[PDB]
């Protein structure tokens, strides 16, 4: 129960990151429930203000949440931010870690939209996962946000877009379960890497769990080498084996990707949009969790 | 499992 800023008020914690702390807050003077992130001034490499920063990019974008306040308060780098609801993780969870088709398919369309509007803003995110997916509350219940630009880092100049140049040789960065081939190879990631993750994230709503799951190493580094070796030798024709051709596409278009391409995002979205017409769904924003009595 | 779900890097 600290004041932070002039007007927001800090109650219990909803989360934790990489770096600070998430706490449930409100807005004194607009009556209005917030996220509030924390992260103490003492820290010898600050991240909060870099990643307003980023957030402050996106602003404008659907599905990026507004920040409402950067500053410092006592001992503490403060954001705060529009208030979301539960991850697409949390959501998998409480849906028995069963998605119908349609659910997948409208969470694709959106998911697509996110990055390419990040993509747009010349970043790309490399963290794309379930857990960063979260649903907004209240009249933005039906709208998927991307959250966690702890990684994201520019591919492209924002005057010229002269694109980053090709690297080889890195360790890997992002999350092991959804990483591009191409990051476990140690290549620099791209707008496509993005892409291809997304494509594990959506396969891994069709299945429960992708096939490089519970890999046995001693270290998290051979952990990364087992799971690199298990993606390479899965064809993408094993791993979506019973589900909709559309998603072996749509994987097997990111891996053909150039790694300075822009990709098709539109084509991207209508092969979704193809298959969830003729299914004969609607675009009507009822998830499997609306189901839930 | 954390070593598979957990982001690294900065
Ligand atoms: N605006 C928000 N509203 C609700 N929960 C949030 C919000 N932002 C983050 N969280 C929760 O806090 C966790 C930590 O967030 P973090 O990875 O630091 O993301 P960000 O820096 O974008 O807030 C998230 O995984 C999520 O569970
Ligand atoms: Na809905």
């Given at each position: 129960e600290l004041r932070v800023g002039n007007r927001y008020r800090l109650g219990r914690k909803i989360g934790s990151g990489s770096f600070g702390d998430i706490y449930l807050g409100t807005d004194i003077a607009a009556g209005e429930e917030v996220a509030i992130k924390l992260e103490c001034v003492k820290t010898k490499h600050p991240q909060l203000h870099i990643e307003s920063k980023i957030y402050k990019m996106m602003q404008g974008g659907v599905g990026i949440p507004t920040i409402r306040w950067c500053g410092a308060e006592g001992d503490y780098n403060v954001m705060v931010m529009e208030l979301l609801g539960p991850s697409l993780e949390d959501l998998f969870n409480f849906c028995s870690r069963k998605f119908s088709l349609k659910t997948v398919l409208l969470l694709a369309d959106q998911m697509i939209s996110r990055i390419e509007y990040i993509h747009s803003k010349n970043f790309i995110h490399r963290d794309v996962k379930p857990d960063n997916f979260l649903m907004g509350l209240g009249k933005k219940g039906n709208l998927?946000?991307?959250?966690?630009?702890?990684?994201?880092?520019?591919?492209?100049?924002?005057?010229?877009?002269?694109?980053?140049?090709?690297?080889?040789?890195?360790?890997?960065?992002?999350?092991?379960?959804?990483?591009?081939?191409?990051?476990?190879?140690?290549?620099?990631?791209?707008?496509?890497?993005?892409?291809?993750?997304?494509?594990?994230?959506?396969?891994?709503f069709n299945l429960g769990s992708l096939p490089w799951q519970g890999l046995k190493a001693a270290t998290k580094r051979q952990k990364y080498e087992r799971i690199s070796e298990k993606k390479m030798s899965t064809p993408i024709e094993v791993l979506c084996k019973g589900y909709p051709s559309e998603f072996a596409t749509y994987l097997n278009f990111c891996?053909?990707?150039?790694?300075?391409?822009?990709?098709?995002?539109?084509?991207?979205?209508?092969?979704?949009?193809?298959?969830?017409?003729?299914?004969?769904?609607?675009?009507?924003?009822?998830?499997?969790?609306?189901?839930?009595? | 499992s954390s070593a598979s779900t957990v982001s690294v890097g900065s």
């Open positions: 998927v946000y991307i959250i966690d630009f702890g990684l994201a880092k520019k591919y492209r100049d924002a005057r010229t877009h002269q694109h980053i140049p090709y690297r080889e040789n890195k360790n890997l960065t992002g999350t092991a379960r959804y990483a591009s081939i191409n990051t476990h190879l140690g290549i620099e990631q791209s707008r496509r890497d993005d892409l291809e993750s997304l494509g594990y994230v959506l396969m891994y891996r053909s990707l150039r790694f300075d391409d822009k990709p098709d995002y539109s084509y991207l979205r209508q092969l979704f949009r193809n298959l969830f017409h003729r299914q004969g769904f609607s675009y009507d924003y009822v998830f499997d969790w609306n189901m839930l009595k | -």
